[PDB]
Amino acid sequence: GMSSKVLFGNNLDRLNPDSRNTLTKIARALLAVDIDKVRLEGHTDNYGDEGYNQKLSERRAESVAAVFREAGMPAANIEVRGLGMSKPVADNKTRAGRSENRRVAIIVPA
């Protein structure tokens, strides 16, 4: 369940109930131990153009941000960033790699 990486289907930007429940637990844990800040970075595969992917990455990051806000984390303490297709961690040549690029990274910055 719990992971810093949240995955999405091809061209999708929402969260199913299992994902939302997992993310609520992460959010509530961070709230409980009085963490200052969470940074949510949205990402895409490189299919489609820069702008298309930029906006998709923003929608993904916002979906995750909303779960943190609903759990009680103030918006002022959440940094939401879409990086589009620019910072892959896996191989866009393959389905498996593209799948691992379709993500939000949950970060607790120092």
Author numbering: 61 to 170
What does the paper say about this structure?
The tripartite signalling system YfiBNR in P. aeruginosa modulates intracellular c-di-GMP levels in response to signals received in the periplasm and is a key regulator of the SCV phenotype. The effector protein YfiN (also known as TpbB or PA1120) is an integral inner membrane protein that functions as a diguanylate cyclase, consisting of a periplasmic PAS domain, a cytoplasmic HAMP domain and a catalytic GGDEF domain. The third component of the YfiBNR signalling system, YfiR, has a key role in the signal transduction process by bridging YfiN in the inner membrane and YfiB in the outer membrane. YfiB can release the repression of YfiN by sequestering YfiR at the outer membrane, which requires both membrane anchoring and peptidoglycan binding by YfiB for full activity.
Crystal structures of the periplasmic domain of YfiB were determined for two different constructs: from residues 27–168 to 1.58 Å resolution, and from residues 59–168 to 1.39 Å resolution. The YfiB(59–168) construct also excludes the region from residues 35–55 linked to increased membrane attachment. The longer YfiB construct crystallizes with two molecules in an asymmetric unit while the shorter construct crystallizes with only one molecule per asymmetric unit. Analytical ultracentrifugation data confirms that YfiB(27–168) predominantly forms a dimer in solution, while YfiB(59–168) is exclusively a monomer. The YfiB(59–168) structure lacks helix α1’ and strand β1’ and has a considerably shorter β1 strand than its larger counterpart, but otherwise retains the same core domain. The two structures can be superimposed with an r.m.s.d. of 1.3 Å for 105 aligned residues. The largest structural differences occur at the N-terminus, which dissociates from the β-sheet in YfiB(59–168), and in the β2-α2 loop, which packs against helix α3 in the shorter structure but is directed away from α3 in the longer structure. Strand β1’ and helix α1’ includes residues that are proposed to form a linker region that unfolds to facilitate membrane attachment and YfiR sequestration. This is consistent with our observations from structures of YfiB alone and in complex with YfiR that reveal structural rearrangements in this N-terminal linker region, including shortening of strand β1 in YfiB(59–168) and complete unfolding of β1 upon YfiR binding. The structure of P. aeruginosa YfiB(59–168) was determined by molecular replacement with Phaser using the YfiB(27–168) structure as a search model.
